[PDB]
Ligand binder design. Structure first.
Ligand SMILES: Cc1cc2nc3c(=O)[nH]c(=O)nc-3n(C[C@H](O)[C@H](O)[C@H](O)CO)c2cc1C
Ligand SMILES: Cc1cc2nc3c(=O)[nH]c(=O)nc-3n(C[C@H](O)[C@H](O)[C@H](O)CO)c2cc1C
Lengths: 168, 168
């Protein structure tokens, strides 16, 4: 039971960690911003268990990616922050009344939050990925948008294909 | 707490799943027997939490490997059985009185069990990896032995290098 939740959380983290390495920077946009579906399983986790289940996934994926894809000891962090802010608000919307109309709108406000909060913390995190400008933040945002959207599209498709033997 | 256990179990499963693909059949021995350290983290899991924590890891690693490295819908199973039999007895030895002397001997009896039980179930599982002879079982055993040993050596080294800031 508790163990059933734990087992699946683990599987989702495994797949996420994997997809962590299938990253591919965006044309015309900065390359420290890479983009992967290490976040889609984070979302299946959250719309199956808690948002806490979700956060566990975004978090474990990022830690592992840290040790290994090291040399970028911040990138991991930004990827977590986006993951969690977005998954949190998106759940903090699909949470309330009803479902599907709510899920999708939860994803739209989700990417909007994510982009805001991250363009903010990016004006106090782009600096430490010097350790390891405004025009830079307007290479940032365009990115965040597409991540929001695309993760949403992919998530949505798969979450759909759960109807299969979720029932039928 | 419960969540701390769950987090680390997840990390260990992620690393295991990964190491699942770094496999490399043994010279002079059959090639459906591949050999990987997808089992070492299973062991760190068990000598840190339950043997149940251990089994969760050997199990999640094998499931994922199933879906993906499919085409071998039995290999996954045999890898689980070895993993669990060995990790189980090895813990069912380091469990009792004292530690280190017990840990190592737990690994010795562990590989001896694993080899026995698997050469057994292999005389009623080599057949279904036709679906998907005695001389074959004496390409099997020599394998099982080296897996026991080598996993043990590797496990032992790493488990050691936990002294670092496990304390100092
Ligand atoms: C400086 C820096 C900024 C990042 N900003 C974002 C971001 O704003 N949104 C996002 O989804 N991922 C972001 N990432 C994550 C990036 O896609 C991923 O962590 C890669 O591992 C970086 O190589 C950022 C990474 C770095 C290093
Ligand atoms: C027919 C068959 C027998 C196997 N026997 C063993 C075994 O005896 N011991 C072991 O540790 N792994 C065994 N494996 C696991 C193998 O190393 C791994 O799971 C690969 O996925 C097989 O291609 C076996 C796999 C197959 C297909």
């Amino acid at each position: 039971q508790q163990n059933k939740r734990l087992i699946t959380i683990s599987m989702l983290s495994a797949i996420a960690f994997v997809l962590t390495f299938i990253k591919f920077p965006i044309p015309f946009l900065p390359p420290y911003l890479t983009l992967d579906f290490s976040d889609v399983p984070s979302l299946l986790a959250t719309f199956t268990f808690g948002p806490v289940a979700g956060i566990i996934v975004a978090l474990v994926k990022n830690l592992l990616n840290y040790l290994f894809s090291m040399g970028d000891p911040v990138g991991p962090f930004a990827n977590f922050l986006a993951g969690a802010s977005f998954l949190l608000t998106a759940y903090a919307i699909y949470k309330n009344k009803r479902s599907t109309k709510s899920l999708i709108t939860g994803l739209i406000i989700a990417t909007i939050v994510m982009t805001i909060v991250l363009s903010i913390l990016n004006y106090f995190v782009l600096l430490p990925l010097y350790g390891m400008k405004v025009i830079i933040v307007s290479g940032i945002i365009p990115f965040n948008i597409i991540k929001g959207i695309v993760i949403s599209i992919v998530f949505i498709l798969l979450y759909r294909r759960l109807a299969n033997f979720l029932k039928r």
